[PDB]
mmCIF file of C-alpha atoms and ligand atoms in Angstrom:
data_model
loop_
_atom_site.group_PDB
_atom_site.id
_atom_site.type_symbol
_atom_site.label_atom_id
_atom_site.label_comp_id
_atom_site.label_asym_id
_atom_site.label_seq_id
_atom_site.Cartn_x
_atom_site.Cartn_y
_atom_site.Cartn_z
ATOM 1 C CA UNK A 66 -3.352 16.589 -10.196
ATOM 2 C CA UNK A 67 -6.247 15.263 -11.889
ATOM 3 C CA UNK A 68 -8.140 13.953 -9.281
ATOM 4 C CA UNK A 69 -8.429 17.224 -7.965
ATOM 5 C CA UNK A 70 -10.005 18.700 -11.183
ATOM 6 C CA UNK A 71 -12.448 16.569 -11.319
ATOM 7 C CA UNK A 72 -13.130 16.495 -7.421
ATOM 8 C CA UNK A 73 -13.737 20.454 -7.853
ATOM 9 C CA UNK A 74 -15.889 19.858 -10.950
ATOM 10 C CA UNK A 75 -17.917 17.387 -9.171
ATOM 11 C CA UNK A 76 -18.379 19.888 -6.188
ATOM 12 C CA UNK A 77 -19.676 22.486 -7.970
ATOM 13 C CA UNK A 78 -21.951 20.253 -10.377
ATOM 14 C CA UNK A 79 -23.686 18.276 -6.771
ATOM 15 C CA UNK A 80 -22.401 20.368 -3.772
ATOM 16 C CA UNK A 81 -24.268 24.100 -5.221
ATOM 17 C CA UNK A 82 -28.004 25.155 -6.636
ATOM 18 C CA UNK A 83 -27.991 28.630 -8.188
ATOM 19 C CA UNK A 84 -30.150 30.644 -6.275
ATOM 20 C CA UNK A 85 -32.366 33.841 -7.629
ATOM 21 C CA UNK A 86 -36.313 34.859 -5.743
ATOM 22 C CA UNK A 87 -37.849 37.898 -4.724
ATOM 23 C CA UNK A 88 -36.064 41.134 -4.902
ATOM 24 C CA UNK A 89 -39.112 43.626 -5.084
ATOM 25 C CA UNK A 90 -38.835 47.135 -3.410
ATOM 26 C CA UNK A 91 -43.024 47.706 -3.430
ATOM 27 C CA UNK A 92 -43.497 46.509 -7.261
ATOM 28 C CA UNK A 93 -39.584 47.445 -8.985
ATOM 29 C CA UNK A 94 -38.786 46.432 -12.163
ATOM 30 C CA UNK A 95 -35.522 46.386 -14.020
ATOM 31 C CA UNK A 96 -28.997 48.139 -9.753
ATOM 32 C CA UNK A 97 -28.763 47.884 -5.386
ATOM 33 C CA UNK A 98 -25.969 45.789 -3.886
ATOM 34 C CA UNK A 99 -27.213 42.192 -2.727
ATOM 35 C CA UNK A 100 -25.405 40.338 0.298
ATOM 36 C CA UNK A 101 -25.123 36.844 -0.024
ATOM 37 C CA UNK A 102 -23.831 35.398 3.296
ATOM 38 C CA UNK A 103 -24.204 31.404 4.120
ATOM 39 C CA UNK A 104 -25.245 30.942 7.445
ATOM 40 C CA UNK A 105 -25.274 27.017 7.630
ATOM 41 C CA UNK A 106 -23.933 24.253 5.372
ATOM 42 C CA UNK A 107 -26.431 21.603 4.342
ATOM 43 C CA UNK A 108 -23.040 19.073 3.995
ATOM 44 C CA UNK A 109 -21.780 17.838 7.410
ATOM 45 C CA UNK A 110 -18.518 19.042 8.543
ATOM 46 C CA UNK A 111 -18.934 17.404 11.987
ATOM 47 C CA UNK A 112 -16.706 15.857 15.227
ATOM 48 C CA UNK A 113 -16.409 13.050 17.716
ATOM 49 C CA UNK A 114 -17.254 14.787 21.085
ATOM 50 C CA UNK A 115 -15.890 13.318 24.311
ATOM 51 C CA UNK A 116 -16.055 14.812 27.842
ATOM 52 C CA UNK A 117 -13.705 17.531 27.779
ATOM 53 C CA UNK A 118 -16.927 18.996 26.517
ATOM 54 C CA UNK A 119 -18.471 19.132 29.756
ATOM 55 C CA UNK A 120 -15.598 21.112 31.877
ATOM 56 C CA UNK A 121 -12.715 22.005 29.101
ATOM 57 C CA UNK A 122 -14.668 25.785 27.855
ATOM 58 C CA UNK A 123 -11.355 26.253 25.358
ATOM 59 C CA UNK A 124 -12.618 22.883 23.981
ATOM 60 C CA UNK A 125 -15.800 24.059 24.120
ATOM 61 C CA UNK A 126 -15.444 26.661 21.904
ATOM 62 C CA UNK A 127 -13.735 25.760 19.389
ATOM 63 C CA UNK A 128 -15.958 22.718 18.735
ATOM 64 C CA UNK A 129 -18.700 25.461 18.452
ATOM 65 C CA UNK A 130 -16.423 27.686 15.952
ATOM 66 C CA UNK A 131 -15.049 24.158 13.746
ATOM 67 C CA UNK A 132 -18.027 21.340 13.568
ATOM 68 C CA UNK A 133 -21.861 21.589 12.863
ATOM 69 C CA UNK A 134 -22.203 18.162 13.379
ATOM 70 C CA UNK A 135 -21.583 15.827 16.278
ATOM 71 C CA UNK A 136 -21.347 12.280 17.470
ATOM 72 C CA UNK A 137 -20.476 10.969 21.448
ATOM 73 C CA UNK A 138 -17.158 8.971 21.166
ATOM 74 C CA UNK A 139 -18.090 6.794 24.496
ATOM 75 C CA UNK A 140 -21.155 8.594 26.479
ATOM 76 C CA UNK A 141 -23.899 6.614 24.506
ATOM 77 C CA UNK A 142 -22.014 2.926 24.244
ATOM 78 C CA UNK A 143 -23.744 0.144 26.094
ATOM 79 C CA UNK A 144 -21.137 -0.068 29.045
ATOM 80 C CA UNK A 145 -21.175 3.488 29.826
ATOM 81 C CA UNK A 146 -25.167 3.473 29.803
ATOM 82 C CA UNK A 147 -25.190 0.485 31.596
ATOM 83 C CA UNK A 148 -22.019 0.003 33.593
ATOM 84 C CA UNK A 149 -23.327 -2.922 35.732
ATOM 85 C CA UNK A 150 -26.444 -4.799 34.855
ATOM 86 C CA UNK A 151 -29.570 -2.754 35.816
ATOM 87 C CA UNK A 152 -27.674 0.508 36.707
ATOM 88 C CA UNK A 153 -28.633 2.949 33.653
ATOM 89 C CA UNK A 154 -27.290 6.368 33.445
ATOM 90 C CA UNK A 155 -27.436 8.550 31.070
ATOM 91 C CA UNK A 156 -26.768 11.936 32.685
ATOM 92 C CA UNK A 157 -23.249 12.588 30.512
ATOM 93 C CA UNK A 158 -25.247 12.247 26.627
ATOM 94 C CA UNK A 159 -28.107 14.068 28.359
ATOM 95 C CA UNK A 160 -25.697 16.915 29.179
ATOM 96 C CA UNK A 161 -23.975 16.677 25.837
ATOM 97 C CA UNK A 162 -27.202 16.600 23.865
ATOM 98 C CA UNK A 163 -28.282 20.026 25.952
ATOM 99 C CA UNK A 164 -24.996 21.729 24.608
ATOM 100 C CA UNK A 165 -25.761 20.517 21.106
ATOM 101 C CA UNK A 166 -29.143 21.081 20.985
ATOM 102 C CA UNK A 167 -28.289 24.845 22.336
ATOM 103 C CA UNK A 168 -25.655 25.307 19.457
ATOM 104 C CA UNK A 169 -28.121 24.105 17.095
ATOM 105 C CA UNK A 170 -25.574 20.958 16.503
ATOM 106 C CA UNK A 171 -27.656 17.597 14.984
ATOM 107 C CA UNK A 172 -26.170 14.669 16.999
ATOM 108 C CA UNK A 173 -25.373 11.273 15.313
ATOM 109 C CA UNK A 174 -26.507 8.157 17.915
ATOM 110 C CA UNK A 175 -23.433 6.404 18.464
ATOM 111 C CA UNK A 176 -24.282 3.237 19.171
ATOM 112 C CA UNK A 177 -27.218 1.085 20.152
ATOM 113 C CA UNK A 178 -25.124 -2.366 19.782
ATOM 114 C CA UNK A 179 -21.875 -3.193 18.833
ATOM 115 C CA UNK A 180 -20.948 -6.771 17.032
ATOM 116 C CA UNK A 181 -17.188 -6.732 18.630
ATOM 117 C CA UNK A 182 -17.217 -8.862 22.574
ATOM 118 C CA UNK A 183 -14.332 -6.733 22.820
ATOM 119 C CA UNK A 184 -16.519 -3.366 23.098
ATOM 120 C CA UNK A 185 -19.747 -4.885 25.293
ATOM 121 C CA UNK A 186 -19.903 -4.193 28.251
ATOM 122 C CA UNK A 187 -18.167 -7.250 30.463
ATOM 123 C CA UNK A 188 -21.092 -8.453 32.832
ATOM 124 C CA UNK A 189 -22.510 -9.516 29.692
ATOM 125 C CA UNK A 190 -20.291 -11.838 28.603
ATOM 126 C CA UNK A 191 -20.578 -14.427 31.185
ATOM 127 C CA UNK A 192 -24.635 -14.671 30.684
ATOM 128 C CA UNK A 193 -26.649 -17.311 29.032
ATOM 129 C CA UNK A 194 -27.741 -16.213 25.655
ATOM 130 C CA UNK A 195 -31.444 -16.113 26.628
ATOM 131 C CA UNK A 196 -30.370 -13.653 29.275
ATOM 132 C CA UNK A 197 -27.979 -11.731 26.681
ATOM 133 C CA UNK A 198 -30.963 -11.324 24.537
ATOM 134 C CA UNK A 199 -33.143 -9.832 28.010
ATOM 135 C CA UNK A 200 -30.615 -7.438 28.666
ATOM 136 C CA UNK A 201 -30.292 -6.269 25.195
ATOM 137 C CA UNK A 202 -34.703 -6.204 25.139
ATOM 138 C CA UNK A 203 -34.064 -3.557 27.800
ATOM 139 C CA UNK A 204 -30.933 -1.981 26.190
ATOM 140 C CA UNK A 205 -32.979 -1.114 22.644
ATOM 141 C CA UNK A 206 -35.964 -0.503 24.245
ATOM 142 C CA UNK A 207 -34.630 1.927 27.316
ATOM 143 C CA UNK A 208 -32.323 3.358 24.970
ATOM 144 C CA UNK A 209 -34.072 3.522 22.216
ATOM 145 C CA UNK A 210 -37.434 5.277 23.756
ATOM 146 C CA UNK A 211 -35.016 7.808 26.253
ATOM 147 C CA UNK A 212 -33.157 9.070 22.617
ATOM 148 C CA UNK A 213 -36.082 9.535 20.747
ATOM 149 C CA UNK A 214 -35.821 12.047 18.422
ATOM 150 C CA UNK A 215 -32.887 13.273 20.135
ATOM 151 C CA UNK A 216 -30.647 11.659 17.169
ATOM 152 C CA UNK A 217 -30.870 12.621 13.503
ATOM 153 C CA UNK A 218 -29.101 8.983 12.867
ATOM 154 C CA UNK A 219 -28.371 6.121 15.138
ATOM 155 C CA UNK A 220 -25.424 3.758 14.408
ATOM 156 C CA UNK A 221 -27.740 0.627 15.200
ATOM 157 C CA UNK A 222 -25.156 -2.270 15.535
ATOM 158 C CA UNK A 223 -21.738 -0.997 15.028
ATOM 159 C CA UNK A 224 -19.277 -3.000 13.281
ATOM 160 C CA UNK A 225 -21.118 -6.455 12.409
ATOM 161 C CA UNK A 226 -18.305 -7.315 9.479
ATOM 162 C CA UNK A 227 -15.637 -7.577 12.158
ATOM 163 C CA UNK A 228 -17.576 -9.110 15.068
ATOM 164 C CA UNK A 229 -19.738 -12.291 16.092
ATOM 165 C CA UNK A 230 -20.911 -11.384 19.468
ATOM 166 C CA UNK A 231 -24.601 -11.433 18.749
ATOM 167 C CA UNK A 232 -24.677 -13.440 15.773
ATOM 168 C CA UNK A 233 -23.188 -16.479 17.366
ATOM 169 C CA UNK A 234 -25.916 -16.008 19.613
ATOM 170 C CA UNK A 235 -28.838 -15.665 18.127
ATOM 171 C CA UNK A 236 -27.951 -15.424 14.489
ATOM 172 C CA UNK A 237 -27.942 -12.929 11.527
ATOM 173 C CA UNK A 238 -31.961 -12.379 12.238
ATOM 174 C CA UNK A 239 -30.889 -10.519 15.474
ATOM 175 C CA UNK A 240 -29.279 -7.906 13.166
ATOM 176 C CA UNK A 241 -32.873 -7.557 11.794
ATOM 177 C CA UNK A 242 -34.572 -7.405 14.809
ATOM 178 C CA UNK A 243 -31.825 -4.721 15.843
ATOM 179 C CA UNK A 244 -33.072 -2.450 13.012
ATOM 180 C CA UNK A 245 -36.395 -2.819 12.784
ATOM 181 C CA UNK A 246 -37.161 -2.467 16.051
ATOM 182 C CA UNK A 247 -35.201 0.932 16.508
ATOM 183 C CA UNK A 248 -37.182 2.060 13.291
ATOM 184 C CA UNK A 249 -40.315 1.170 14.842
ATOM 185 C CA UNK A 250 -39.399 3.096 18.294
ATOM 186 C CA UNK A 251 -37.615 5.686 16.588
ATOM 187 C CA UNK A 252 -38.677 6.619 12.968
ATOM 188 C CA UNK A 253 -37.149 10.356 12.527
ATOM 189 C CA UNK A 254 -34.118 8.329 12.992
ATOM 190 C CA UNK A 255 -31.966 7.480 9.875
ATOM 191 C CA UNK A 256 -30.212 3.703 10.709
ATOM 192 C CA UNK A 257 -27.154 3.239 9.675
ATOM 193 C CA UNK A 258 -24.516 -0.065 9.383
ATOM 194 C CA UNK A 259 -21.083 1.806 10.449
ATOM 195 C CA UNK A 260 -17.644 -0.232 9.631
ATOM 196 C CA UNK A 261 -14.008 0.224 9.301
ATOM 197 C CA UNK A 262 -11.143 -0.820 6.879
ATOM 198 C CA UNK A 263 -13.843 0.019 3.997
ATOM 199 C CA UNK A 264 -12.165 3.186 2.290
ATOM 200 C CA UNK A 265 -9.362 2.887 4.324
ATOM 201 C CA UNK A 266 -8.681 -0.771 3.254
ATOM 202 C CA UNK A 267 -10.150 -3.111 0.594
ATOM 203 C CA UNK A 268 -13.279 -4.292 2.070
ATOM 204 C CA UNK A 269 -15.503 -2.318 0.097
ATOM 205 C CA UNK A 270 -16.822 -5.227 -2.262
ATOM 206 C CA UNK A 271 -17.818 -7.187 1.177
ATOM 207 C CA UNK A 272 -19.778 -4.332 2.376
ATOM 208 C CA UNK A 273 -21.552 -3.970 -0.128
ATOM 209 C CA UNK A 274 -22.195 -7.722 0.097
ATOM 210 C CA UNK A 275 -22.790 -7.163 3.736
ATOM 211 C CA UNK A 276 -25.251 -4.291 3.168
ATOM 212 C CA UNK A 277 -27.213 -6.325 0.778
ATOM 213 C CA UNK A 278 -27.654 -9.321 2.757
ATOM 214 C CA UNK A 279 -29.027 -7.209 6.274
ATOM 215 C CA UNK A 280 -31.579 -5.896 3.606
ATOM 216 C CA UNK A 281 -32.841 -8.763 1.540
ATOM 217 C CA UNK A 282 -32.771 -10.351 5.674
ATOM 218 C CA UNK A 283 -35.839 -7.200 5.862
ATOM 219 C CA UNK A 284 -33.226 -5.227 7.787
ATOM 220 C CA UNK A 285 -34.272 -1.362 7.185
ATOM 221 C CA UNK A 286 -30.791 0.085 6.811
ATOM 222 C CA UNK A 287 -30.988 3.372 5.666
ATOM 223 C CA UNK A 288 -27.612 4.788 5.311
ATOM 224 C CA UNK A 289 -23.789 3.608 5.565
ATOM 225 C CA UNK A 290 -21.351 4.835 7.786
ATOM 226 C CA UNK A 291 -17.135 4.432 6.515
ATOM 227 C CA UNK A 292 -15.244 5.150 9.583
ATOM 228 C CA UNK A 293 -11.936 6.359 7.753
ATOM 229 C CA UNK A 294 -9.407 4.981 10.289
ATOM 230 C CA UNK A 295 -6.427 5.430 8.145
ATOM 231 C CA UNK A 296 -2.701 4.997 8.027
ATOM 232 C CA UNK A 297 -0.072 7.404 7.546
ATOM 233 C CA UNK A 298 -1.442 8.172 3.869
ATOM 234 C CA UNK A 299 -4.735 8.768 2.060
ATOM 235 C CA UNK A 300 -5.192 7.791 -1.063
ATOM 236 C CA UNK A 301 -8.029 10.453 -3.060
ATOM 237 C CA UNK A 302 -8.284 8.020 -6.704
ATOM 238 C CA UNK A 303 -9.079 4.670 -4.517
ATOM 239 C CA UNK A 304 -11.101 6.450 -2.021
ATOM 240 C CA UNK A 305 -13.320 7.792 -4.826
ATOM 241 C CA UNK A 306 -13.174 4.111 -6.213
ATOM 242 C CA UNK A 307 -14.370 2.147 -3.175
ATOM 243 C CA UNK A 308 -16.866 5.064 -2.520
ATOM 244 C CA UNK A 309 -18.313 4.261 -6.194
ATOM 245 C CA UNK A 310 -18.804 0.502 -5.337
ATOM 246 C CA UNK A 311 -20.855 1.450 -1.940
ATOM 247 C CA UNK A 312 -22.949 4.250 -4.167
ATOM 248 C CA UNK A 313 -24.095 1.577 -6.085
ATOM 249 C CA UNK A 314 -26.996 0.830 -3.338
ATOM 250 C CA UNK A 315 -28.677 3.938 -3.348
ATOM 251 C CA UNK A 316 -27.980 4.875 -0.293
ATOM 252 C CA UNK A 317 -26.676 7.671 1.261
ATOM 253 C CA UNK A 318 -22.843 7.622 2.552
ATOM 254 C CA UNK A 319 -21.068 9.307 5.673
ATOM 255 C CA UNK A 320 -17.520 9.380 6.079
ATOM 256 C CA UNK A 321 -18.558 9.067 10.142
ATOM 257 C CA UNK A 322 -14.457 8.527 12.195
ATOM 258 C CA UNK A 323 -12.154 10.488 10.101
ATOM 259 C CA UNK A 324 -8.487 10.544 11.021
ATOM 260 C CA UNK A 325 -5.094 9.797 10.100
ATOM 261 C CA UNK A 326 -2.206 9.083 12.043
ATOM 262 C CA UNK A 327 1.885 11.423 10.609
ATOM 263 C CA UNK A 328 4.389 12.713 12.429
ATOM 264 C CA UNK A 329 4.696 15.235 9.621
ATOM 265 C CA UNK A 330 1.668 17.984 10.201
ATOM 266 C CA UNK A 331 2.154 18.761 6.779
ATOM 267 C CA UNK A 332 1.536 15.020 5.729
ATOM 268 C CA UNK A 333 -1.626 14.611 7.908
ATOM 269 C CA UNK A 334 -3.243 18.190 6.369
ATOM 270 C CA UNK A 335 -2.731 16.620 2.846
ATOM 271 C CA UNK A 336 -4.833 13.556 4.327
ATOM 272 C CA UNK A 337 -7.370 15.366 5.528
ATOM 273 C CA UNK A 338 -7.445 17.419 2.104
ATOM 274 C CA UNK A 339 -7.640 14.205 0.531
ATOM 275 C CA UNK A 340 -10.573 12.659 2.005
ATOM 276 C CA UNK A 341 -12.867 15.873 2.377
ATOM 277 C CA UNK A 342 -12.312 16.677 -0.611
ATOM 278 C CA UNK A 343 -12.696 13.268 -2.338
ATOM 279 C CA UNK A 344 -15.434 12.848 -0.162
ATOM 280 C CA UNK A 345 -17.036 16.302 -0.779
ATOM 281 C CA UNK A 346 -17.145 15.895 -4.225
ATOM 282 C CA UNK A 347 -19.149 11.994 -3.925
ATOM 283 C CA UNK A 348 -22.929 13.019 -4.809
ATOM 284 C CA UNK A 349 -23.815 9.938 -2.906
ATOM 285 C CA UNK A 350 -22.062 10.779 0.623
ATOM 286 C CA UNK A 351 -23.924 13.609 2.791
ATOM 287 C CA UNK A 352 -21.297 14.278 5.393
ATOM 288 C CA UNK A 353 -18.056 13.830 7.236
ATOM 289 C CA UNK A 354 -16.723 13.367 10.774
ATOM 290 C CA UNK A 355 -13.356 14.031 12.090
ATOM 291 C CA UNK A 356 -13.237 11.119 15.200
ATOM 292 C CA UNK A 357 -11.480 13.875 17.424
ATOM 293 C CA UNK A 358 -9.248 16.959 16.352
ATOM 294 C CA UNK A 359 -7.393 17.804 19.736
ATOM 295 C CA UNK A 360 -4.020 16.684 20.522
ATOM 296 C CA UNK A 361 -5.049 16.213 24.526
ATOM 297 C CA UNK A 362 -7.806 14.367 23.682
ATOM 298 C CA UNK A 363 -7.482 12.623 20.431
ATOM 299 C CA UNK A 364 -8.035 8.521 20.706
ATOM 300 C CA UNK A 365 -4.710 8.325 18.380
ATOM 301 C CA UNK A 366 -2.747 10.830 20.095
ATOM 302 C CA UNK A 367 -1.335 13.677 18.982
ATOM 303 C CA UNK A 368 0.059 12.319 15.768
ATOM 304 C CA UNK A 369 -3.538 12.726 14.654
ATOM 305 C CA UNK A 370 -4.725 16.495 15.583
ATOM 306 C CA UNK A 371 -5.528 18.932 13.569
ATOM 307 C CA UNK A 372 -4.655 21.197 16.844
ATOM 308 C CA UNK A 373 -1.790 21.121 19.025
ATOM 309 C CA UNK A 374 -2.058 20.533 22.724
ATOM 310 C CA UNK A 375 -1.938 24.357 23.164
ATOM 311 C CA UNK A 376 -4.851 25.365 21.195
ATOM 312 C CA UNK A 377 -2.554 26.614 18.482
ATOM 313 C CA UNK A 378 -3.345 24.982 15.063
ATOM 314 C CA UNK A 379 -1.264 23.042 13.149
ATOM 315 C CA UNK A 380 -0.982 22.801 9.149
ATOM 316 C CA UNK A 381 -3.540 20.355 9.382
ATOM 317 C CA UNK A 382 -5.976 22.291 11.109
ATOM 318 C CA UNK A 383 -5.217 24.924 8.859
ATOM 319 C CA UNK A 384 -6.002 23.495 5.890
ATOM 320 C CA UNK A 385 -9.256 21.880 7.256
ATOM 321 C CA UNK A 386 -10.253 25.396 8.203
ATOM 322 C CA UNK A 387 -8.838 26.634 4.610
ATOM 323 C CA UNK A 388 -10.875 23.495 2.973
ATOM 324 C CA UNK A 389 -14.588 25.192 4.989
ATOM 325 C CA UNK A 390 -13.461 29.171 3.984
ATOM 326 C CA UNK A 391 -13.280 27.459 0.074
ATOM 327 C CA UNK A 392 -16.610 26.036 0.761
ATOM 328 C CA UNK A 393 -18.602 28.534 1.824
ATOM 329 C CA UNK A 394 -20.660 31.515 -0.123
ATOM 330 C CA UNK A 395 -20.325 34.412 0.515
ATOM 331 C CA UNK A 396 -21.064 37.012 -2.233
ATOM 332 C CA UNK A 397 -21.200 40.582 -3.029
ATOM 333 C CA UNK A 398 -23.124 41.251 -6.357
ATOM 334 C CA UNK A 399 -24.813 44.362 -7.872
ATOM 335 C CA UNK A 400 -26.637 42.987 -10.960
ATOM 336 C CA UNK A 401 -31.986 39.904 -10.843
ATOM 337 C CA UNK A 402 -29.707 37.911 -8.309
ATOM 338 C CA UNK A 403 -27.385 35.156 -9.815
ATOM 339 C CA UNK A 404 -24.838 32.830 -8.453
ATOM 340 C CA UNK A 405 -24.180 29.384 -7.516
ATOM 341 C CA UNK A 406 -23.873 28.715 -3.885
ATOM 342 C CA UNK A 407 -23.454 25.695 -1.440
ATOM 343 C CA UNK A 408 -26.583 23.982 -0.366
ATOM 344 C CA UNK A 409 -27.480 25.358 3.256
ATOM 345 C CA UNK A 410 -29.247 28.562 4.769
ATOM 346 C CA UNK A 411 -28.479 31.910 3.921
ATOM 347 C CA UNK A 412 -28.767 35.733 4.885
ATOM 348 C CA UNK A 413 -29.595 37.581 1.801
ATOM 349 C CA UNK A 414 -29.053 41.964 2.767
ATOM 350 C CA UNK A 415 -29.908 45.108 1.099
ATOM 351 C CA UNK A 416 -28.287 40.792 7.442
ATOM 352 C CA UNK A 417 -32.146 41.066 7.087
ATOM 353 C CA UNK A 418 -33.827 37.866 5.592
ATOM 354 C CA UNK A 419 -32.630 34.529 6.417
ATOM 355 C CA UNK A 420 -33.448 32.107 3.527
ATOM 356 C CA UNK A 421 -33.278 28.412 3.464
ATOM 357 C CA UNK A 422 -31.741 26.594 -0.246
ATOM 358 C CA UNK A 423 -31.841 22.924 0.507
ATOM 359 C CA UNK A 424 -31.134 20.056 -2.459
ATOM 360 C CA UNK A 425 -34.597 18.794 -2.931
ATOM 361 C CA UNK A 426 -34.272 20.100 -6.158
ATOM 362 C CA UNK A 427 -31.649 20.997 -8.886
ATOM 363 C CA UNK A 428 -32.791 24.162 -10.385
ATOM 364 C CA UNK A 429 -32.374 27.542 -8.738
HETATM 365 CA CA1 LIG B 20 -19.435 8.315 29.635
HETATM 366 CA CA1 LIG B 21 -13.054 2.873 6.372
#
């Protein structure tokens, strides 16, 4: 179809830099055979991690072998940091973070706050607000200071278009003070707002709205999360049209929850192809999580995997493993080296010298 064209024109025009340096054998000047391997992708293919991480080795591995990127589904929320009021623990993400941080996997913070009563932990919701707004002093500032620079991005307050917990409270300048006080204790850390039913659903145009409001409120948001929660189908031409409402801030976009929910395997790789793809060829989004890809431990069931409860793909998994082969460099050439390759690091051979080709710039 067209969209596709155009997607694949759009990934090579933002997704590549041609790449040529070097080459000298002690002062030669024009022939030899040149290796160009990637080694890691600048773009974030990444993953919701749960527990299984921690005794499930099969899991284990093949998050390792499928995602460079992760994010904690539950072992950095408020109630499972804080189960009961005063009782911190946060032994699980510290344990998660070590397996990362050995795999060389960046870790998105997942999530200071969340807007929705519904998600907060429930000792909290029989407080007084001045005591609300003392435990969540200690919850940004404990937090906050034991994470630092542990997380490339923290989702700050997760959800605040489909909540009031807080800002019945205390009002939309508690949003601000959620932000800039995590910028202040953490700066490496990119903020982010993080929200549903935006590409998957029509509330792009109040986003937006939303975005611009936390920001003329002094709120440093740096980046926007779109969960991708969808239904049964995805949709590449609106996709690529709500995307190109959010772009219009500036602002860098991650497609952060991926998933869809078909019977038909076939179906839900065709969703998946969909989005990354779409969403691959955006130049304002940066990366995408799948929210789970595991048919034991997926939080929409099986109907959503990408692998069956055996550890044996399915089309879906497949194709998203198809979709990363496609995106990836790897080059023979003779030739004095030219090609276009995928932003990331590379091994260039005569595997000898690892190179780095980031996007800072646009020309080779
Ligand atoms: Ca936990
Ligand atoms: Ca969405």
């Amino acid at each position: 179809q067209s969209w596709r064209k155009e997607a694949n024109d759009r990934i090579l025009q933002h997704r590549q830099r041609e790449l040529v340096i070097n080459v000298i054998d002690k002062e030669k000047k024009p022939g030899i055979e040149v290796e160009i391997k990637q080694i890691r992708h600048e773009f974030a293919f990444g993953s919701a991690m749960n527990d299984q991480v921690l005794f499930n080795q099969t899991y284990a591995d093949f998050f390792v072998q499928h995602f460079n990127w992760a994010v904690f589904e539950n072992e950095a929320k408020w109630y499972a940091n804080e189960p009961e009021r005063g009782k911190i623990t946060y032994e699980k993400a510290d344990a998660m973070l070590n397996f990362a941080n050995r795999h060389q996997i960046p870790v998105r913070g997942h999530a200071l706050f969340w807007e929705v009563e519904d998600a907060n932990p429930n000792w909290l919701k029989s407080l007084p607000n001045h005591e609300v707004y003392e435990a969540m002093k200690r919850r940004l500032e404990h937090a906050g200071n034991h994470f630092k620079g542990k997380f490339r991005h923290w989702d700050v307050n997760n959800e605040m278009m489909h909540g009031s917990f807080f800002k019945d409270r205390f009002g939309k300048q508690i949003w601000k003070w959620m932000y800039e006080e995590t910028k202040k204790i953490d700066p490496q850390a990119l903020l982010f707002v993080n929200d549903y039913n935006v590409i998957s659903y029509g509330e792009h145009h109040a986003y937006k709205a939303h975005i611009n409001e936390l920001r003329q409120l002094g709120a440093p948001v740096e980046a926007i999360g779109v969960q991708g929660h969808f239904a049964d189908r995805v949709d590449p031409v609106v996709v690529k049209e709500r995307l190109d409402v959010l772009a219009e801030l500036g602002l860098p976009i991650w497609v952060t929850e991926y998933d869809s929910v078909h019977p038909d395997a076939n179906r839900r790789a065709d969703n998946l192809e969909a989005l990354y793809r779409v969403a691959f060829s955006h130049p304002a989004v940066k990366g995408v999580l799948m929210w789970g890809f595991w048919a034991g431990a997926h939080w929409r069931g099986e109907h959503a995997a990408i692998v069956n409860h055996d550890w044996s793909l399915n089309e879906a998994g497949r194709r998203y493993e198809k979709l990363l082969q496609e995106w990836t460099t790897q080059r023979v050439e003779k030739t004095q080296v030219t090609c276009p390759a995928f932003h990331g690091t590379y091994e260039v051979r005569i595997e000898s010298k690892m190179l780095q080709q980031q996007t800072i710039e646009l020309d080779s």
